[model samples]
Target: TTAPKPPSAFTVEAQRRVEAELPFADRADFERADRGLIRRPERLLIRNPDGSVAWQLGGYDFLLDGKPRDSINPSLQRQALLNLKYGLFEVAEGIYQVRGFDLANITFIRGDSGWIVVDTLTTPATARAAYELVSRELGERPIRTVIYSHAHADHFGGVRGLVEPQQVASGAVQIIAPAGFMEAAIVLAGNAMMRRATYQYGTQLPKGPQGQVDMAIGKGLARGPLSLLAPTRLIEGEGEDLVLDGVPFTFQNTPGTESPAEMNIWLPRQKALLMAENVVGTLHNLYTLRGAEVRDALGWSKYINQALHRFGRQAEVMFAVHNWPRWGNAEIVEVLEKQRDLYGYLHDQTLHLANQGVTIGQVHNRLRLPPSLDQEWYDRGYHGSVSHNARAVLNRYLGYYDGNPATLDPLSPEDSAGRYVEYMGGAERLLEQARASYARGEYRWVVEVVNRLVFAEPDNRAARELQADALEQLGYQAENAGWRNSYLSAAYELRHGVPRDQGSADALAAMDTGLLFDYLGVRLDAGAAEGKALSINLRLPDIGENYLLELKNSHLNNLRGVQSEDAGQTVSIDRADLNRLLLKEVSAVRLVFEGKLKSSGNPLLLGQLFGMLGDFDFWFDIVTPAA
Candidate 1:
C-alpha cells in the first residue's frame, strides 16, 4: 500500500506561498543564463561502461516552462529551469566555459600557445566530454596549465582526461592549487561522510517528475571514474601573484570560506573575476547536511568584503564555478555585497541571540533576516537554509547542551521511544493520533511522534507508511534542494527500502603518514583488543618512514618517524606489497615467502593485530535504525 504520493493540501498551500512571496517578477537570471551565443546538444547524455546512463539532462525536459509540478516546489522549479541552460559559453574575448556537463564548470582560457584550464568537473568522462566539445568548436589546443580552484573533488577530479601522465611527470603541464589542499580533502569518518553524501545528492533516486531534480550545485553528480592529481605548485602568500602563459593573474587565497583551501582568481587584463564557489546564485552552506565540520561564517563574510573592495570595482564581468556569469560592474558588486551580508547577518545575529542567554535550538526560529537582506534573490536558501545554519552557528559557539540539566543525561533513542509508545497506550493509538495530526496539516509533529512507534517496533508497516507519506509532503514543499532531496530520500527508504549495494594513488606517498593512520585508527576494534598490551615497530623502507604502533589502553596509537628499540616485534613491508594484499590480489603468506615482508619476535602477533580490525559497510541505513 506504500507508494510515492503527490503534495498534500498543506504542501500545496506552501507552494502557493512560495510563488507569491518571492521575486518571480524578476527575469534577470533567465537573460544572463541564455545571454552568450554558443552551441549546445539537443539532449546531453553520458553513460557508464555497463551501458547504463551516468548522467542524463534530457530527463528534466518536463521542467521546461510549466506551472510547476504538483509534487515540486515552485521556487525550486525556477532554479531548476535556470540550471537547465547547458552549453559552451563565450564569457569574454579569450575565455569560454563548458557548463552543465557536471556539477562544476570547466573553463578554457586562450593562452599564447595553448589553453589555460580552470577547475575540471567531477569525472573523467564529463571533463573529457566537455573538452571534446571545446576542441570541436574552438580547435584542438594543448593545455598549458591546469588551475584547481579548491580542494573539492569536483574542482579537480578530471586530471587524467585533460592531461597525460607524462605531461605532469615531465613538468610539461603545471598543476596549481591553494595551500593545504590535500589536508582539507581528507576526512576521518570517510565512510560515514560518503553515506550521508549519497543522501544529499540523491544518488540512488530516479531522474523523473516524481523523483530527483537539481542538486543545488548543478543538475547532479557525474557517476563515472573519479581521479585526483597532486599540485605541482601551491599558492602561499597574503596576495599571491603569478602570470600563466600570456595572461596576468592574481590569486586571492580565501581559506576556510566555502572550502578549507580555496582561492578566487582576479584577471587584471580581462577585467574579470572568478569567484570559485564562494559567491553563487544561492546562499552557500555554512554546514552542509552531509556530516562536515562547521565553517567559519565570520571568516567567509570577511573574504567577500575584501573581494568587494579589491576586485569588485575593476571587474567588468564576474563568473563562478557553480552558476552563470553576471555582467556589468554594478550588477556584480551588488551580488557580492548582498552575499557578504547574508553570512555576516547569520553569523552575528545567531551568536547575538546566544549571548542573550537563548538556547541553541530556539535561535533558528527566533532570528529572521531583515527585509533588505531577505528580498534579494541571491540571498535565497537553495543549498543552506536559515534553520539548520542558525543551529550550526550556535553549535559552533555554544556546545550542543542548552544548559538544561535534564537533557544532559536523557535516555537513549531506543529506551525513550519504547517508553513513549507504552505511554501512548500502543502503536495503533499512536498511529491514530498521528493521522489526526496529519489531517490538521501538522506534518512535522506527525513525523516526530510516528518515529517513536517506528523505533519501538521496527516491523510496524503502518507506522512506516504514515511517516513516509508525511515526509514526502515535507519534501514536496521544501524550497531548498538539499532539504527536498533529504526528505525525499528518507521517504523512499521508508517505503521501497534501501536500493541494492554497491580513491587515489595521488600522492599515495604523501598520504602514507597521518590521514591514513588516522583512518586506520578509526577502523580499530577496541573491544577485540581488550586486556591486550602490545607494541610493534613498523618499517617501510621504500617510503623511508617508520612508525611505532602501540596497543595500549585498548587503543591503537601510532608515532611517526620513531621506532621503539625494545618493541615486541619489528615488521618490515613495502607499501606496494601491503596494498596488493588488502586488494585481495595476493596472500600475506605468499608475500612473506616472496621476501616482500619480514617479521621477527612473535610473528603470530601480526595475526592477532589484524583480527582486531573492524570493517565498515557503505550501504548502512540512515532513515531507519541500523540492522
Candidate 2:
C-alpha cells in the first residue's frame, strides 16, 4: 500500500558487499553505451489520438541521480542508468539505431533507395516516435523494408507504426522474418504463461525505486497500441542470403535461442553483426521465470559458436537488440567467444552433474560457473540467475521428475502443506519457528515453514504478515529484476490482496483463429462433459475452411476441412464473426439471434458445448501457497 519499508540493515550490508566486490569503475559499458547518441528529447512522450498517454520516458528519471539506494541491487541500478540513455545513434557506416524507446532497439540501415528498419519497438506508438525522430534527424526517407529478428512481441508488434498495411499490400514495403515466427508468437498468448508474464514484466507494479525500477533488459516495456503485420518473406534456414534494397544481408537461423524462432543477421558491407537476442549484454534465461519450455542450452551454445567462427573475426562491430554495441574486430571477437563459452559451460557442467546421479535440486545447488566465466560482468545474471538456469538445464535433459521414487508423484502444494503443518505441530508452532527464522535473516527458511502455516490456516494474520516481510527482504536483495518483481508482487498481494483487473485482454484479440481455438480447447472442463457426446460442424465461408468439432469421452477434438456426416448440429459463421465471439464482443446467443451465425440441427447441443468451457481466473496466486 505505502512505499516498501526501507531496506533492512542486512540488505544494506549486502549492497555494500556487492559494491566492494564488483568492478563498478570499469566504465567501458557506460562509455560505449553513450558513444553514438545523436539526440534524446528532454521530455519524450507519445500519446494516442484520443489524448491518452501511450509511453513516456520520464518514469525512470530517478535513475539519472546515479546513486544506488539500499532498496535496489547496485548492478541493476547501474543497468537502469545505462538503459536511460535513449536516442538515435550511428552504429556503423550506413547503419543506425534508435535505442531506449522500448524494450528492444530499432535499427535503420540506409539502403540504395530509402531506409530499411529492423526490429520495431514493443508498441506502435513508441515505434512511431522513434521513426519520427530518425526521420527528423536524418533527411526523411521512405521505409523500404522491415526486418524482425525473432518471434517476441517486442520485435514485431509495432509493424503498423513503421509502415501502413496498405503500403505492404501494394508492394511498397517488404516484411521479413525467420520462418515459423507467427506460430511462435502466439504460443504463450492465452495461457497461464501470459499470466505469469505479468509478474515477470512487473506490468501491474507501481513505478518508483521502491517498486519496479527496471526490467533487467530495458527500462520497461511500452504500454501503447500493439499492431502486427504478417511477414511477406521468410528466412527458412541458416546461411540464407538475401539482397534487400541493394544491401546484401546474410542470416543465421538460430531457433530456440532466446526465442523459439530467432535469427542473427550479418552485414557483409558494413561489417557489423546483429546478434539479435542470441547474445545479449547479460546472462539470458535458459528458462525464463515467467515459465515456458526449457530452451536447448547446447543448441544455443553451438549457434553462437557458428557465428563466431563464421563472422566474428571479420566483423568490425557487434550490436544487439537490448544493449550497446562493441567496437573493433578484436573486442567483438572476444565478446562473441565469451558469450559462446557462457552458454557452453553452463550446458556441459549442468549435464555433467546430472549424469553423476545428482537430483535437480542438488545439481542446482552444486552447479556454479568457474571464476573465469563468473568474473565477466557480461556473464552476470542480471536477467537470468545461474541457480534457476541450472535447474532449467536439468529440466531440459530430465523433466520435473528427479528419478527419485519419493518425488515421482508428490502431493499438490495445498495437500502437502496440510500434512506438513500437522507433522510440525500445527500452524501456531510453525509460525513461531518462522518468526525466529525471519529475525535471523533466514528468509528462505522462513518462507518454507511459514508457507505451510499459511496454507494450513489460510486466515492466520500473523503467518501472512511474517511471510510478506520475508518476501520483501528477498525482493530487496535480489539482483535479477524478474525475481525481485515476483517477490515484491507476492508481498503486495499478501498485504493488499489480489487485484481484480485481468491485464492483457488486448493480447487475446490479436490471436489467430487457430490459436483462439487451441486456447478454448485447453479451457474445456472434462468433468462437465462426462458421458456427453456432441458433434458440430463449423464452416467459415469467407476463409473457405470447415472444421468438425467432436466432444467424446471428455475430450474436445477438431478436424479441419472435414465435416462429420453424423453431426448433431452445424453452424455457419464468418471468421470475423468468430473472432468477435471469442473476444466476447458479440455473445454466442447474440450472434445466433442476429442470424449472423446460421445453425441447423440440434441448437440445444450447441448450448451444451458452450457450457463445457471453463472460465479462468487471471488473478490466480503464484507465489503464495494458494493456487
Candidate 3:
C-alpha cells in the first residue's frame, strides 16, 4: 500500500516558472471556447445497463470552470477548465458541434431540410445522446448522410446510433469515407491498445487537481458500446468533389497524415474548413504514448501548409473532430500557419540536433522551438511533448541502437535493475540516496534510481511507496497531459495494483475476412504448433473469400484466394460465424448446430489448430516488472 504526496517546494517553483515564463496573459483560448455556445447541461451524464459509467462530466467539478490549481500545471488546469464545458455548440451558420460528449466532437451540418453528421463520437450511446441533444435544441431532421473525417474510433465508431446500417445498405443515407478507411479504421491491436490506454486515457484515475484533469484533447472518453457501418461512398484522392444533400463539399484525402486514411473537408458556400484531426486545440502526438507507428512530423507539417494555401485564405471558420472551432479569416490563417510550422519546427529541429551527433537521449532537451511558436499556447504540448517525439524521430531513422557497442545488446529491465542495485551497494543504499534527490525535486533521477529497487524487489514496500510519491510529483509538474496521465497511472499501479481491462469490443466483426485470418495467424502459438504439419481449406462464401491455412513447423501461413487441392480438412463458414468462433464468444458446437460451419475431411484437425491459438493478457504490467 502507498499514499500520494503533494508537490514538493522544488515542484512548486517549477510550476511558478511555467506560469511566469510562458504567455499566461493569453485569453484568446478562453474567448474561443466560450464562443458559439447554444446550450450546456448542468451535468452531462450517461450510463450502461449494468450501472457502470458510459460517460459523465460531474467528476470534473474540481476544475471550477477554468480556475487554476497549484498542484496541477497552470496550462493543464486552464485546459481542464475549457474541457469542462459540455453541451451543444453552434460553430457557425448551418454548422453545429456537440462538444464534451465524447473524446471527439460530433458536428451537425444543415443540408437542405435534413441533417448531415460529420465525425460521430466514440460509441453508440454517446452518439445517441448527442443526437438527442441536437434534436431537442434545433428540432429533429432526418440524417440524410454521415461523413467520417478519418479512420479513428472517435470519428466513426458511433455510426449505428446516429444512422442505421440498413439505411446505408438501402442507399437511403449515404455514408462517405476516405479511401483506405476500412483498412485503417478497424481495431486490429485490441488487447495491447487497451492495456496501454489504461494510462493514455486515465479513465480509472480519481478526478481532482492531483488526479485526472483532461486527456490532452478533452476531459475523458466515453465507455459506450462501439459499432460501425461500412461506408457507401469512398472519396478518392485530393480535391474530390461531391454535393451531399445539396451542400457543396470537397474532400482533401490526407492518407498517411493523421491516421492511414484521413481527409479534410471544404464547404464552398459557407467558406468553412473541417481540419479533421490534422489541427487541434493543442499539439498532437508525433508518436502517441498509447503506441502507434511513428507519425511523420514532416509530412503532417506539409499537409497543413497545403491546406492553408489551398483553403485557409478564403475560409471563414475552422473546426475539427476535437476541440472548439476557430472563426475569422485572419485568425484562421494565423492558426493554420502556426500549426503547419509547429510540426515542421519540431521535426526539423529534432533532426537538426540529431544530425550534429546528438543522441536521442540528448536531443529533446537541446532542441527548442523559436520563441514565436514556443509562446503560442495552441502550439504547446497538451498531447505530444517534445520529450518522446524527438526520440521517436531517432527511432524512425536510426532505430533503438545508439551506435554504442555496449548498448547494442542491453540487459533486460529486471536484470539490469538487479545489477545496478548491487553496483550502487544494494537497494537500501540506492533508496537512501533517492530520497535526498526526491527532496531536491530531482524527480527524473529519483524515478530512475528508485525504479531499480522496484524491479529488483517488487514486493519491497518502501521502494514502491517512494517511487509512487516521486512519480506523483512529476505528474503534478507535467505540461503534457499524456505525460501526466502516464506518470500518475504508473504511480497508481504501484499504489492500488492493476484493476482490469477495456480491449476493443466487436471490432473483429468489421475486419475483412482476409485481414481477420492475417491477424489470427499472429495469435498462433508457435510452441504448440511445433513439428505439426497441417493444411486446412477455409471458405467464407459470405465474403467470397477462400484461404488455405497451413501450419508448417511453428508458423501459420494464410494463403489468400488459394485453397489447397490436397487439404486434409475443409471448413466452409460465413464470415460472421467465423468471427464469433474466433472471438470464442460462441462455441464451435453451437455454430455447427446452427448450420454456420460445414466441415468435411478430418474436422478434428481444425480444433487442433485452433487450440494452439494464444490469447493476450488484458492486465499486463506496465510500470511494474514484466513477467
Candidate 4:
C-alpha cells in the first residue's frame, strides 16, 4: 500500500495552534505517571502453543522519543506517550498493577494468604502474560479471589486464563462482580453491535500512523483466546462492604456511568481507591461512538459527587483500570472534584440549552467547556470529543426526534439524494462545486455533496474517491481515537468496497438460549409476516424448558412457560440442536430428517415461521449515503 500523504498546510497550522495554546510544559502528569518505579519486560510477546502469535507489544514504538507528527493531534500524542509507560508498578504498600498489558490494566492486591486479582485483561493470553510478570517480581502466590470491576469484556473476559473454572467450582478460588454484570455484558454481543465495534476499535485497520495508531486507552486490543467465568459472589448495592483474604473493600455501585454494571472499590486500610472506568485519565464517552444506549450523564455525575464526599479526603492514592494512579490526599481529591464537575457541566449545560428549544445539532456546536475545566489534562477529549458528548447528553433528555415535524418521518437516504441531485442542477455541476469546496479545505461540506452524488450514482468512481479523500482528511485531524478509526474505516470501504466476511460468529456462539431467541425475534421480517398468525411450542426436554412463540400482527412474542394446548405446530428438540441450527452448523431440514427435531400438528408452519426471518448484512453502510 502506498504511504499516507503528509498533512495539508491547514492541518499543520491546526496542530501548531494546539501546541501553542495547551500547557505542553506541564510535567506534573508525566512525573505522577512514572512515580511508581518497577520492572518492565525487555520484550513482551505472548504466543500460543501452536506457534501462532497471540499478543505482541510493538505497535507504538514510533512514539518513543519523537516530536509530535503533523499527521497526529498534539493532545493525543501526549496521551499516547503516557499510555506507552508499561510495567508492573507499585500503587501502594500491598497493591501492584500491570499496566499497558491490554486496553485495561490488571491489578493485583496482596492478601494475607494469596493475591487477589482485579479486572483481568482483555484476553487469556494477555492476562497470563501479566500474571507471569507479577509472579516474577512479587513472588509466586495463588489467586485467592478474582473481582470484575465492571461488565465490559476487557474487565472479565480473561478470568478463565488466570484461574480455572474448576477452581471456582471447587471453592478453591472465589469470583466476584457487581450485580447484573452478566446480563449487561452480553447485551452488546449481538451481530450489529459487534460489527460496529470492529470499526470503533479499528480491528480490521492496519497498525501504523496512517491507520490504527492508538486506542487512547492503550496501544490497541490484544488478540488472543477470549473467555468468561460467571461470578460466584455479587455485590448487591452501594456502600456494600466485604472482606476477602483479610483485605477490606467498600464497594460503591456506579451504574450507567461508563457501563451498566460498574462499581468503584474503596480500600479503607490502604487508603487506596479503585475507580474502575468511572474516573479515567481522559473524558469518557457519554455515548460511545460505536452504537450503544446513551449513558446517563446525570446519574454519572451524581455518583462521582457521592464518591468525592464519601472517600475523597481519606484516600491517599487513587487508581483506575485505564490510566496510571494518583497519590497524595489533596491531589486525589482535586482530580476527583474536577472529574465530577466535568460531567456535571456537560449534563447541566446541555440540558439547559435543550430546555430553551435548542436542537441537538445546535447544542453540539455551541457547547464548550470553560477554561477552568478545559485546562485539566484529565478532562481532555482524547477518547471522547466534546461535540458528540454534548449531543449525547441532549439525546439522553430530548431523544432523537429533535422536536421537528419535518424530521418526524423524513425521506430515506436514497430518496433524499435523488431530490438533492435535482435541486443541485446535475451531477457534473455538483461535482464542480464539491471540487472547489474541497480545495478550500471545506471537506465537511464537500462530503455532503459528494455523498449525495455517490448514493445517486454508485458507479461514479470520481464521486467515491472524492468522498474517500474527504474522510481521510477528517481521520487525520481527529483527536478522539474512535472518531479517527471510524473515518479511516469508511475511507477504506469507499476505496476498496466493504469486506464480505468481517464480524465475528463467536459473539453469537457465546450468547445464552434466551438472548439467542431475543436476537432471532428482532430479525423477523415484519412486512413479510403482516396479517399472518402462527403459534408454535418449542419443547427442550434436556433442559425441561418449553417456550410458546406466537407470531401475530407481524410481531413475535415468546413466553417462557407453556401457554396454550392448541398450537399450529409443536417442535421437540434439544436446546443444543437449536443452537447449532442458529449458528448454521446444522441445517434445520437435516435436523428434522434425522429425527433430532420431531414435529407434531401442522409441521408446515415451522417452515413458514423460519421463512419470515431476514438475513442482516453485517457490512451495512455507516459513513456513506448508502443505507
**Largest lDDT belongs to which candidate?**
3
lDDT of 1 at 86: 87
Question: Counting only residues 3 or more apart in sequence or on different chains, how many pairs clash (N, Cα, C under 3 Å) in candidate 1?
Answer: 0
Q: Please write out the lDDT profile of model 4 over residues 1-627, one tens digit for every residue.
A: 223556777777777888887788876878977877588888777875456776666767777766677777778788878888888999999999998888889999999999888999987778888999988998999999999998888888677679997898899999888887777767523567767887778877787677877888777777766677878988885647999999999888874433238788999999999997989988999888777888877788888888888888799999999989899999998889889889999999998888888898689788889987888888888787788999998888788888878899988777788779879988888888888888888877777778998888776778878888887777777778888888778778778777766622334444665676676688889889999999989898877888888889988888887757878889999987877787678998899889899989998887898898997677787655544
Q: Please, what is the TM-score per model?
A: 0.95, 0.93, 0.96, 0.91
| Off by more than 4 A, model 2 | 1-3, 49-51, 187-191, 255-260, 425-428, 500-514, 585-600, 603-607, 625-627
Clash pairs for candidate 4: none
TM-score of 3: 0.96
Model 4 worst lDDT window (10 residues): 503-512
lDDT of 3 by residue, 460-569 (tens): 88899999999989899999887888889899999877866433344777677777767777888888988999999999998898999888978788888898779999
What is the number of backbone collisions in each predicted candidate, taken in the order shown? 0, 0, 0, 0
Off by over 4 Å in 3: 49-51, 65-67, 187-189, 255-260, 500-506
List CA RMSD, all candidates.
2.2, 2.8, 2.0, 3.2
Q: lDDT per model, in order?
A: 0.83, 0.82, 0.84, 0.82
Lowest summed lDDT across 10 adjacent residues in model 3 is found at 499-508
